[PDB]
Amino acid sequence: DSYLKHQEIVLDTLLPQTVSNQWRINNDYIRQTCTIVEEMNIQQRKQINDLEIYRKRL
Amino acid sequence: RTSMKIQFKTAMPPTEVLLESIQSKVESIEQLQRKLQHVQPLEQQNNE
Structure with a gap:
């Protein structure tokens, strides 16, 4: 048993x-x-900025 | 029939004396065995 x-x-x-x-x-x-998820967040913000920036120029 | 009587009466006394002491220790030993069967089954899922 032991x-x-x-x-x-x-x-x-x-x-x-x-x-x-x-x-x-x-x-x-x-x-x-959490490292990359931030980097992807950074990318998308910049993406949306161009998207409207290119419009407002034209 | 003398032997069967004499011997099996001794056997039943030796058995019931042992059983009283050893059925408790069997349960002790047998319930411990079941713990290996769960300690193993978890081991594999963690390794996996």
């Missing part, structure tokens, strides 16, 4: 190690998403 408790705890340690590295990968992705 052996089975040593066997069990080992599995749940790996559950945490996987849990941490899985959340750690997603954590890095998050920053990337």
Whole structure:
């Protein structure tokens, strides 16, 4: 019965190690998403500016 | 029939004495086994 408790705890340690590295990968992705999403926002604003600018010139 | 009587009476006493002590420890040991089967199934989904 004691052996089975040593066997069990080992599995749940790996559950945490996987849990941490899985959340750690997603954590890095998050920053990337927010980096570019801003850059795309910057692009679209500039896009709309030309769109009306070119009209108001003509 | 003497043996069957003598032996199986001893067996039933040895069994029920063990069972009383060991059915509790079986449940202890068997409910722990079920924890491996869930500790494994989560392990794979996290690895995946």
